[PDB]
Tab-separated table of C-alpha atoms (C1' of nucleotides) and ligand atoms in Angstrom:
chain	number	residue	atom	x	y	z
A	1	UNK	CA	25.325	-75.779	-205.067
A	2	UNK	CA	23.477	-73.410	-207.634
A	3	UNK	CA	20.886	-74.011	-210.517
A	4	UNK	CA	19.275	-71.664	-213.117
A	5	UNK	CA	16.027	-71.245	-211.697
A	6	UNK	CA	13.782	-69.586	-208.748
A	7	UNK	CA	10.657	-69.740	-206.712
A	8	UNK	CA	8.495	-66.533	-208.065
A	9	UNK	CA	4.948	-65.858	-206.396
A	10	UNK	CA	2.075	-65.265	-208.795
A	11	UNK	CA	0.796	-61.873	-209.856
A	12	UNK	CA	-2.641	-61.061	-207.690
A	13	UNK	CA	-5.783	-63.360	-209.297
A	14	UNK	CA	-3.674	-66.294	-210.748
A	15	UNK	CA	-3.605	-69.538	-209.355
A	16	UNK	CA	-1.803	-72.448	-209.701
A	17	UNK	CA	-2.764	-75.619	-210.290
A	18	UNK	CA	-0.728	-79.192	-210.152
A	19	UNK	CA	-2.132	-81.438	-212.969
A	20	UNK	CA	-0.893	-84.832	-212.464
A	21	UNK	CA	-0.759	-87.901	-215.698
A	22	UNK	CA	-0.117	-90.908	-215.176
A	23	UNK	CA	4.322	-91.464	-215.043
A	24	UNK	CA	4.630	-93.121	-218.314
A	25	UNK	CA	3.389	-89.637	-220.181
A	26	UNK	CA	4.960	-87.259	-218.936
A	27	UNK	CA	7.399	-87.289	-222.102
A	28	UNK	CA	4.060	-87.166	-223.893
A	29	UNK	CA	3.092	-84.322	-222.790
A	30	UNK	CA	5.983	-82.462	-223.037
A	31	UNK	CA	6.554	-83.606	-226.447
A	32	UNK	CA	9.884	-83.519	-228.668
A	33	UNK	CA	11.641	-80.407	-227.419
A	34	UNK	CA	8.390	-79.296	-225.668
A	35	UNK	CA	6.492	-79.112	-228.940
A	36	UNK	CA	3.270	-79.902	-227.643
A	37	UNK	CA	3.509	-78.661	-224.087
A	38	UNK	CA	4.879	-75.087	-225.247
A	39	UNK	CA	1.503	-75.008	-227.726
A	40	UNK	CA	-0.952	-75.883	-225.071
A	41	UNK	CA	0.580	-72.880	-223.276
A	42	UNK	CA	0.448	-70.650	-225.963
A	43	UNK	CA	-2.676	-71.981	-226.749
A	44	UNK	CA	-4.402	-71.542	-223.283
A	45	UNK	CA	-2.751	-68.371	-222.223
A	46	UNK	CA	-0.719	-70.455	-219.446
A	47	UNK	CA	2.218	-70.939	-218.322
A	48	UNK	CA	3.567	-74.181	-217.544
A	49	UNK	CA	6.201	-76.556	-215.346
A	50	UNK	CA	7.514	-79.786	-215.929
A	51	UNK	CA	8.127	-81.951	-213.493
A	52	UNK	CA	11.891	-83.258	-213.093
A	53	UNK	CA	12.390	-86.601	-213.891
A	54	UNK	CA	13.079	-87.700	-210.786
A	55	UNK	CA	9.951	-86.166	-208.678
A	56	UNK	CA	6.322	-87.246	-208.846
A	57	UNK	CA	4.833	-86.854	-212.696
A	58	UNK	CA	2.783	-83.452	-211.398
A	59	UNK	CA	2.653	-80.761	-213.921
A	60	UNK	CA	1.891	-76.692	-212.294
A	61	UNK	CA	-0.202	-74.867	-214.545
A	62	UNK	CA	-0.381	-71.053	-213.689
A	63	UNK	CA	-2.629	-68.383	-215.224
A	64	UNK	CA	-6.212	-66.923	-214.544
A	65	UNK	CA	-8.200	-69.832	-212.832
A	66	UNK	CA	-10.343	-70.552	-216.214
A	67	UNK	CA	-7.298	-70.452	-218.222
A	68	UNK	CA	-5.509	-73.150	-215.928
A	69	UNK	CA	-8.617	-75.509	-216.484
A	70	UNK	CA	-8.744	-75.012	-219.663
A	71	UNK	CA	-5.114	-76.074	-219.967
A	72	UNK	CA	-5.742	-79.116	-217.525
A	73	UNK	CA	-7.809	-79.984	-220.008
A	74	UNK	CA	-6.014	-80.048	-223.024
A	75	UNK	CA	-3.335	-82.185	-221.006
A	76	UNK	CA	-5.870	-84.740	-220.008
A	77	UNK	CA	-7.093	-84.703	-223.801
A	78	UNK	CA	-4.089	-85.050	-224.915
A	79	UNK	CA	-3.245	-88.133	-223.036
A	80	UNK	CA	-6.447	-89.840	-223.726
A	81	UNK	CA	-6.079	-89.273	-227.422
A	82	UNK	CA	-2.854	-91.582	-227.341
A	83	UNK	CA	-3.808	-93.524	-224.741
A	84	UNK	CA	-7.197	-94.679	-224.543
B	1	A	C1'	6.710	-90.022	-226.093
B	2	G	C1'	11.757	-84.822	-221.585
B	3	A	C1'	11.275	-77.845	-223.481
B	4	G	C1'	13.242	-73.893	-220.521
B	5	U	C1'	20.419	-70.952	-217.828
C	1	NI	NI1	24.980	-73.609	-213.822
RNA sequence: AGAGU
């Protein structure tokens, strides 16, 4: 058995963090082709994992620690913007 | 309203 991907460890001083949503928006947060998940990255100086579709709906969130909470928050944002 | 070789 083989995939495409691999366990790294961080660089020294970054941390990361699982964010989990709720399972119904996960695909929200991703967005269409990872529109809105790749911007909150960009956006927050992250960088950002998915959780598969068949695992528990926990996103990892790597970067300096006040760049990881700032991206937890944009997630949570996000979600509460469409959801209420 | 599911992106990553
Ligand atoms: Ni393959």
């Amino acid at each position: 058995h083989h995939h495409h991907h691999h366990m790294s460890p961080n660089l020294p001083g970054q941390t990361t963090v699982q964010v989990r949503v709720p399972y119904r928006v996960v695909g929200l947060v991703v967005g269409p082709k990872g529109a809105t998940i790749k911007r909150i990255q960009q956006q927050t100086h992250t960088y950002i994992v998915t959780p598969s579709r068949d695992k528990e709906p926990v996103f990892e969130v790597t970067g300096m620690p006040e760049n990881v909470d700032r991206a937890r928050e944009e997630i949570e944002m996000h979600i509460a913007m469409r959801t209420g």
